[PDB]
């Protein structure tokens, strides 16, 4: 019993943190076989930040001008190349401690874990969720930029995102491994505003699944709802709009607590309606969405 | 900016965790050097659970009679001793994954990261406290036992929690890495329930102090108090006085904020009088009391 939001275990991951110094500027690398992979943003002064033409600034910059630190020794970059928003910088070694990896595209809602680095020096580690703007609520600072969210399928590393920016609304914006930004976002320091943050209903009746199995059950009552009708209430709460496809997602969650889809639909739609009325469903005071039914499942079953 | 619950790194545990079976029974087990540490819970039965003669139950024990499987190699165990409630069995390979470690013993209100294993497996890892009954509101479930709390200062994993059960109220007790308990709890089958769940004061301060920092600052009022003054309403509201070493301890975040910590106290003695009114701080409606002044520093200065 109880309910904690787990990241995965990152040592595989801090196998494949360098530093990459590019002049002044200092942030993360992720070093896979005989590439390393940071923002091409590295390229950047605080002068070019602000209307920079990376082809230009990239014409400028040779293999040598690219410092890899793997812990305190140094790579040889022996050929760089810029794919989207990314720089890929092949060294003359293969990372001896290159796991099982994919570079997989995440949808809206999905949730990853974020090994948090500076100087190529992995700080902390914290459970994530791709918001529907495209956006996450992370914990970075200067320096941060490089740090990657991942999933781990037994011992392959699905890397999801590498960290590029900061809004100045406080949220962080990044690309998957292949440098394309999630949302409308540029590496550019311009006026850049995030959507509506909207709730992700299905990863909350997930956790309301998850609060019914660890015996925090108080929130459930003696109604049921539809789809359509539960879905107008949604859109007035600024949550997601729920489809079959969750509905039949949530169908194993469903199948073990022996509580249908549509009547937990109705225990939230009550709990969006009152509020908590000062109570806490898994010591939480608001409904967490930052929790997918396969992370509820996974955690609830101990898959290592 | 951004303030996120915070794990540290678990790939220098990972490589400590091994699966200890003795019978039916297997739960995880702490390879350091040529010792591995598990609870010694391991040698019961689910009949001696209730009323175990430990020193009586491991006169029936013999060195092969339990098996340490790292990875998927067979550990050769070479003698074992029960020390408080963990057993230490000597094998004859040192870990050659073992880092620089100590055996620390926590106060409660102390912040530790967790690394949930199962099998010897690690399957996620999440950031915890000492709760001040001597509990901790993990995330485990059966096979968990073994799975270790830890705070590593830059390469230095001091080992301060081992996980050996759940209570009949759904928390969970363990030992230090000597095999004593914290709080008042044995490894028995039997009635035991946790004390009061007082909030960490000092905690929740250095948490309004984060938020201050990441530009949450609407809960901030005009008002001072004393610490009589605020212990007062402290009591009220189930929260841990507040001393002077807890002001001293906040003094550096109080400096970089130019917030005085009584001040703050005024802010927290109006939140806890009055509630959120439905508002949230670091995208939280309850008052979080699982970092420690220690740790908002950490994450706020991004030390790897
Ligand atoms: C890791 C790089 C960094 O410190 N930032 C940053 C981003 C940029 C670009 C995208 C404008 C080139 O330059 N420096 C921070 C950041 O996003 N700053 C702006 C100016 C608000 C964009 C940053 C701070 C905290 C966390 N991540 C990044
Ligand atoms: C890892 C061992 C386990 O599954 N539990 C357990 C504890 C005990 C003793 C202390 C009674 C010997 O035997 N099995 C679970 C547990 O604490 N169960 C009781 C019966 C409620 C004590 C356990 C479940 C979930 C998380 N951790 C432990």
Redesign the pocket.
């Known amino acids: 019993s109880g309910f904690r939001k787990m990241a995965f275990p990152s040592g595989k991951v801090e196998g494949c943190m360098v530093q990459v110094t590019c002049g002044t500027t200092t942030?993360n690398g992720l070093w896979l076989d005989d590439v390393v992979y940071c923002?091409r943003?590295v390229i950047?002064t605080?002068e070019?930040?602000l209307n920079?033409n990376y082809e230009d600034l990239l014409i400028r910059k040779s293999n040598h001008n690219f410092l890899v630190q793997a812990g305190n020794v140094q790579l040889r970059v022996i050929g760089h190349s810029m794919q989207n928003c990314v720089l890929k910088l092949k060294v003359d070694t293969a990372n001896p401690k290159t796991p099982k990896y994919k570079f997989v595209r995440i949808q809206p809602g999905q949730t990853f874990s974020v090994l948090a680095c500076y100087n190529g020096s992995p700080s902390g580690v914290y459970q994530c969720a791709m918001r529907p703007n495209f956006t996450i609520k992370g914990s970075?600072?200067?320096?941060?930029?490089?740090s990657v969210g991942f999933n781990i399928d037994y011992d392959c590393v699905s890397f999801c995102y590498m960290?590029?920016?900061?809004?100045?609304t406080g949220v962080?914006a990044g690309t998957d491994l292949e440098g394309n930004f999630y949302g409308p976002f540029v590496?550019?320091?311009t006026a850049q505003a995030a959507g509506t943050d909207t709730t992700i209903t299905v990863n909350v009746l997930a956790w309301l699944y998850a609060a019914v199995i660890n015996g925090d059950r108080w929130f459930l009552n003696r109604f049921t709802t539809t789809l359509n009708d539960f879905n107008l209430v949604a859109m007035k709460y600024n949550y997601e709009p729920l489809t079959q496809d969750h509905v039949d997602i949530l169908g194993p969650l469903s199948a073990q607590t022996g509580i249908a889809v549509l009547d937990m639909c109705a225990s939230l739609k009550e709990l969006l309606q009152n509020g908590m009325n000062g109570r806490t469903i898994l010591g939480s005071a608001l409904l967490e969405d930052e929790f997918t039914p396969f992370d509820v499942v996974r955690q609830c079953s101990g898959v290592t």
Chains 1, 2 share one sequence.
């Open positions: 942030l923002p943003h950047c605080s070019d930040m920079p970075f600072l200067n320096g941060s930029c490089g960290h590029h920016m900061e809004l100045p962080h590496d550019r320091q």
